[PDB]
């Protein structure tokens, strides 16, 4: 798995190219890959860390 092949590159490009067309028709959900990376409680926890760094640096 350390190396890549022509089959691996072609499969990766075909998979990533069919995932992009299925968002126009909305026949795939992809809410998990969205919200596991947005994660708004993690976002406000990080903003609280930035606010605490503003408090500690002033």
């Amino acid at each position: 798995y350390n190396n890549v092949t022509l089959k691996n590159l072609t499969a990766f490009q075909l998979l990533s190219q069919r995932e992009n067309i299925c968002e126009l028709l909305n026949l795939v959900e992809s809410t998990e890959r969205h919200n596991s990376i947005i994660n708004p409680e993690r976002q406000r926890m990080s903003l609280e860390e930035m606010k605490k760094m503003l408090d500690a640096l002033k």
Binding site: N2, L6, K7, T10, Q13, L14, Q17, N20
Partner: protein, 244 residues
Amino acid sequence: TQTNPVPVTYPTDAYIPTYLPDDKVSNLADLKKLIEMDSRLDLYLTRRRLDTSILRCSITIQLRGVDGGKVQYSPNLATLIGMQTGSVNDAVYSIYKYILINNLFVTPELGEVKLDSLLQKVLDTNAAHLPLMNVVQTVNKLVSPLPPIILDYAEDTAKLREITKLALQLNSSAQKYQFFHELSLHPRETLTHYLWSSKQNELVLQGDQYFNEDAARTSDIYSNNNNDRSLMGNISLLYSQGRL
């Protein structure tokens, strides 16, 4: 370390995208400032890390402190240096600076020195020219050790790995942005591109299905597959090359 850098498996500081519109982000400049701040601070640290080093019997007792920090000099070399028992590198530097004071090289022309009185006395040689390599080789012979007592009668790697993984996720999100933006501007000649390239990549993935175990031990490749035409047409060529 080596003379060349070490290849390694995991990525190391992949790029930051530059094609995102700055009317919405207005933040990649600030992260850029943080990155060159880190590079400047690391430059300072690396420079300072480099520059921080820049019958009657006798009594014989081999002590605890047989130590080469102060090593005994031969008395000829002690007269040439002046110090009593200092060190070995101090001796080499003092001999070389004595040679450099007396202007003996040339006014191999810089290898050969002019042998003077005291230096021939401390080397027990009588040449006029003798190269400096052998002169400083003799220093290893002229020095003897000190006499004993005689009486007679990290987390930073994982953190940078996490930042690299996160920058790769940023690249993925930016490429997925740019696809839909370029489809939004002119949609015709990207949907034709999709219908071409998806078909071509399907043909490329289906270029390998007749090379299995039990798809070649059987007979449904050679017989009756003139629909395929790919192999069993090379046999007019391969016999003519002698391979068989």
